[PDB]
Amino acid sequence: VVTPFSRDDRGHTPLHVAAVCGQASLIDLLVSKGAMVNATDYHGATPLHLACQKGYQSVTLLLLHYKASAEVQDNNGNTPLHLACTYGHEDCVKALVYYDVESCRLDIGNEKGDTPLHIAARWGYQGVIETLLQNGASTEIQNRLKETPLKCALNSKILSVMEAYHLS
Amino acid sequence: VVTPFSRDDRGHTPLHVAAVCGQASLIDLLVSKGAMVNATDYHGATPLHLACQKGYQSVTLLLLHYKASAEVQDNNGNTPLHLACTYGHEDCVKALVYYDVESCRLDIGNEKGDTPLHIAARWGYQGVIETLLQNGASTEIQNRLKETPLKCALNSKILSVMEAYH
Amino acid sequence: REHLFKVLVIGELGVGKTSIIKRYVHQLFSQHYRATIGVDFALKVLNWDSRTLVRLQLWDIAGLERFGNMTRVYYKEAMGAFVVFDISRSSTFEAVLKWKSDLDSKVHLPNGSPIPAVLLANKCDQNMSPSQMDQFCKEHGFAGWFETSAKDNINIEEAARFLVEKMLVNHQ
Amino acid sequence: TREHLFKVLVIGELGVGKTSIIKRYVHQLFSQHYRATIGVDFALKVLNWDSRTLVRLQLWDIAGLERFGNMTRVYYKEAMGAFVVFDISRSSTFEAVLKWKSDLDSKVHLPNGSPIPAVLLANKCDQNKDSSMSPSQMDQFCKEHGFAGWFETSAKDNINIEEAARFLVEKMLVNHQSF
Ligand SMILES: Nc1nc2c(ncn2[C@@H]2O[C@H](COP(=O)(O)OP(=O)(O)CP(=O)(O)O)[C@@H](O)[C@H]2O)c(=O)[nH]1
Ligand SMILES: Nc1nc2c(ncn2[C@@H]2O[C@H](COP(=O)(O)OP(=O)(O)CP(=O)(O)O)[C@@H](O)[C@H]2O)c(=O)[nH]1
Ligand SMILES: [Mg+2]
Ligand SMILES: [Mg+2]
């Protein structure tokens, strides 16, 4: 039968492989057979991290269902939510923000001190930015280089979208 | 029971939606219930195009299995192979290049006259570039702006990888 | 005192689910149909009392998703649901009992009793008596029903409140 | 030169050596460093069978995980033959070959309706021998379960990979004179 604790030399379990392929029935099976959901690969990446970078919302939710943790940090200090913010997958960003009614933290800084809202401002993903703001994302909280999320905004458009909220 | 010909106002069938979600059992079901595999959305995009842009190799193969066409062009003249070359998904690029045991054509130009190898050189994806060259990708064929794929190479490193072959 | 309620919105495709939510939360409407992809989410905050704040997590569930294996995941620990159909399409009404089966067989309250469900007859601004709806609801375990239009903002507020009321009772 | 093109499956359990066998055969390289294959990988081998004949091998590298995932009907379709691989240093991976063999045969036939030629590979033969299986027993095994043949191989040291490839190409060229 399946050995769900099997590793390769980058620390990829089968459950990591299932995540990055989107194969959700595989996930069901692997979890059912023992697989460690918050297994970390050689650079600190959870299968949830892989789902949130590929943008598979289906898998992201299925993992969170099977009690994956969203607060795990990779070598770069990134949660899965950071990774979904850097690659703009708002469908995944939402799954994370809403899965748990004690909702995702949002103040967690990576190695560069960037919260998810910084990252979202940087690459200019508006829908993401909004979703985050709607759920309480701080606009002051200050990255390592002493920047706020406003500071990080791409253009005057995105900037003003954020300022909208700040004032409220 | 399911209506697989249903359209929204961008011309997305359920099979388009399944593709972009990676939900492969959905695809199986939809195809089984009638769904048009080479259905094109409002901007000329096949569900295979969506799979090859999201990079879902699983789905891209399952579509090809259910007889999707790889030579369909979107509003920008891109085949799914172009889209997989622009976003670097070599796992998908490979599926396309190897599915069919004849070829699959690598000379198809998009609106800008770019073949897949141009696009791969541009963004510098080495594994892609190689896979294409190994399966015959021409190095001369000239985009609209009169560029070759070599011309389009990112750096001297990639350039030489291509010159290796030619 | 703050509550937070996961509310499902479910029903067949094109039935109006996304537009109901978008109206309720951002007072907007489009005529343009963009199919929802998997599950969309929205947050409504409201001031029930001086004493009470409630917060609604609105889970917008693509009408396609009932032919996939993912509903057990979306539904889990839901505090209640809007089941939606399109008055202008009888087929979508027959569907509500599919969705209702799915729902009840996969989410219960803490008590073990089914979760409060409110039936929405949407698109009521276009072209089943009230006494029949009541019999229908009474037979199939809907708390209640409403003719709604996201286009014109009929009855969406009132439906929300009716359901919040039910769920606040259940928090006893 | 007539040109042939053969889809060849490479299958078997995880870490068993499939990718490295292919990488050796095609690029003469070996790494000790295990990178799990994700879904399906591909490679192309060209070879000069003689004066008159060129053959071209599409090598379908199939993650050992993929046998628990119902995508195998897709990968296998219209395959012209297969390497089934196990790790001489792990008896568990040998028990597995009959799983993979079942899967294969129940889902791909030749044009004739007969099963496709399958060659069993006992890989990592440069280490120490675990399956309790003499050469005369391998032959009985192959004979009983419809393998064309078997080979002890090492991608590490390039044992027997060439000879296995040829043995299989030979089988499949025979089958091209049956349709
Ligand atoms: N007249 C009228 N039209 C409506 C109303 N609500 C929605 N529509 C129209 O019906 C169409 C479908 O609405 P939508 O909210 O996308 O439906 P949906 O249930 O989310 C369909 P899916 O589940 O695939 O995402 C839209 O084009 C919308 O403008 C309404 O109350 N009245
Ligand atoms: N000594 C020795 N080691 C080998 C040989 N072939 C492979 N290995 C080692 O075994 C490990 C796994 O090899 P790999 O080819 O990646 O196995 P695989 O079947 O492709 C594993 P998967 O199917 O899960 O991708 C690697 O560390 C590799 O170096 C061999 O012939 N001899
Ligand atoms: Mg919708
Ligand atoms: Mg491999």
Residue numbers in the entry:
A (entry chain D): 453 to 620
B (entry chain E): 453 to 618
C (entry chain A): 22 to 148, 153 to 197
D (entry chain B): 21 to 199
The authors write:
We determined the crystal structure of the complex between the first ankyrin repeat domain of VARP with the GTP hydrolysis-deficient forms of Rab32 and Rab38. Many small GTPase:effector complexes are believed to form dimers, which increases both the apparent affinity and specificity of the recruitment of effectors to membrane-anchored GTPases (Lee et al., 2009; Panic et al., 2003). In the crystal, all VARP:Rab32 heterodimers form identical homodimers, resulting in the heterotetramers shown in Figures 1C and 1D. Further evidence comes from size exclusion chromatography with multiangle light scattering (data not shown), as well as the observation that, in crystals, VARP ANKRD1:SeMet-Rab32Q85L and VARP ANKRD1:Rab38Q69L contain the same “cross-dimer of heterodimers” across multiple crystal forms, as compared to the wtVARP:Rab32Q85L complex. The majority of the heterodimer/heterodimer interface arises from the VARP molecules contacting the other Rab32 molecule in the tetramer through residues from Switch-I and Switch-II that are different from those involved in the VARP:Rab32 heterodimer formation. This second VARP:Rab32 interface buries 1,460 Å2 of solvent accessible surface area, making the total solvent accessible buried surface area on tetramer formation around 6,400Å2, which suggests that the tetramer should be stable. Existence of a dimer of heterodimers in solution is supported by analytical gel filtration, which is consistent with the existence of a concentration-dependent equilibrium of a 2:2 tetramer and a 1:1 heterotetramer in solution.
VARP is a Rab32/38 effector that also binds to the endosomal/lysosomal R-SNARE VAMP7. VARP binding regulates VAMP7 participation in SNARE complex formation and can therefore influence VAMP7-mediated membrane fusion events. Rab32 is an endosomal Rab GTPase, thought to have been present in the last eukaryotic common ancestor, with Rab38 arising in vertebrates as an evolutionary gene duplication of Rab32 (Klöpper et al., 2012). VARP has been shown to interact with Rab32/38 via its first ankyrin repeat-containing domain (Tamura et al., 2009, 2011; Wang et al., 2008).
